[PDB]
């Protein structure tokens, strides 16, 4: 795992992504912290969202363990910061680097799945009253992520 | 199970 994680870290330094940033916490290469910028023209714009990342010992053959530490209003992300997303479990692929995973998570923000939700209450609002969903997501973005 | 076991080694 180490050689793989080091190359990811080196590639990030060489070619820094714009939508996200990630790096190790101290000396532990298996514990990273990341930020994702809230996409423009969305209820999350202006927002900066932090995530905690743990690479398992058998990375990259098992997915990184990724969770938000910033609060975010979303059908597939709960108040624990837990993210229910298929590439983080059954649809994982060894080819996915942490940067691609973070971009993937970012694209999930404006493409939720309300039909199979982690947070039913938020899903219901999303499907029935979108203006309200947008309103509350903005309020949370202003309050917790800025 | 499918009834298939690992290759004998």
């Amino acid at each position: 795992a180490l050689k793989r994680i080091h190359k990811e870290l080196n590639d990030l330094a060489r070619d820094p992504p714009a939508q996200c940033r990630a790096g190790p916490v101290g000396d532990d290469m298996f514990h990273w912290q990341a930020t994702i910028m809230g996409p423009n023209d969305s209820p999350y714009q202006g927002g900066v969202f932090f995530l905690t990342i743990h690479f398992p010992t058998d990375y990259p053959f098992k997915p990184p363990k990724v969770a938000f530490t910033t609060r975010i209003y979303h059908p597939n992300i709960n108040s624990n910061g837990s993210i229910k997303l298929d590439i983080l479990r059954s649809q994982w692929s060894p080819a996915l680097t942490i940067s691609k995973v973070l971009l993937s998570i970012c694209s999930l923000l404006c493409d939720p799945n309300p039909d199979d939700p982690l947070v039913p209450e938020i899903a219901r609002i999303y499907k029935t009253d979108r203006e309200k969903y947008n309103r509350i997501a903005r309020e949370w973005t202003q309050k917790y992520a800025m | 199970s499918d009834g298939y076991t690992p290759e004998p080694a």
Binding site: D11, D15, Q19, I36, M37, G38, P39, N40, S42, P75, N76, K84, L85, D86, I87, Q91, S93, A95, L96, T97, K100, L103, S104, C106, S107, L108, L109, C110, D111, P112, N113, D116, P117, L118 | -
Partner: protein, 77 residues
């Protein structure tokens, strides 16, 4: 007529000859021809957002030498 770039799965950058009228489907078909990944496994990302199949590069304001980011097909749950 113009060119754009795509950041493939392994971080490799490829160049695509396109034009503003091209649909995202067309772009994914061009990516398939170079990288050998089927369109339905492609998820293209620009400005933190997924690009959907029916729209065009023009509809997303993608201009000359913009960089699209390729990840794998995903679904929230």
């Amino acid at each position: 007529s113009m060119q754009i770039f795509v950041k493939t799965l392994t971080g490799k950058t490829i160049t695509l000859e396109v034009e503003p009228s091209d649909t995202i489907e067309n772009v994914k078909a061009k990516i398939q021809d170079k990288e050998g990944i089927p369109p339905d496994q492609q998820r293209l990302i620009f400005a933190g957002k997924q690009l959907e199949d029916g729209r065009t590069l023009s509809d997303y304001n993608i201009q000359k030498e913009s960089t699209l980011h390729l990840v794998l097909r995903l679904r929230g749950g």
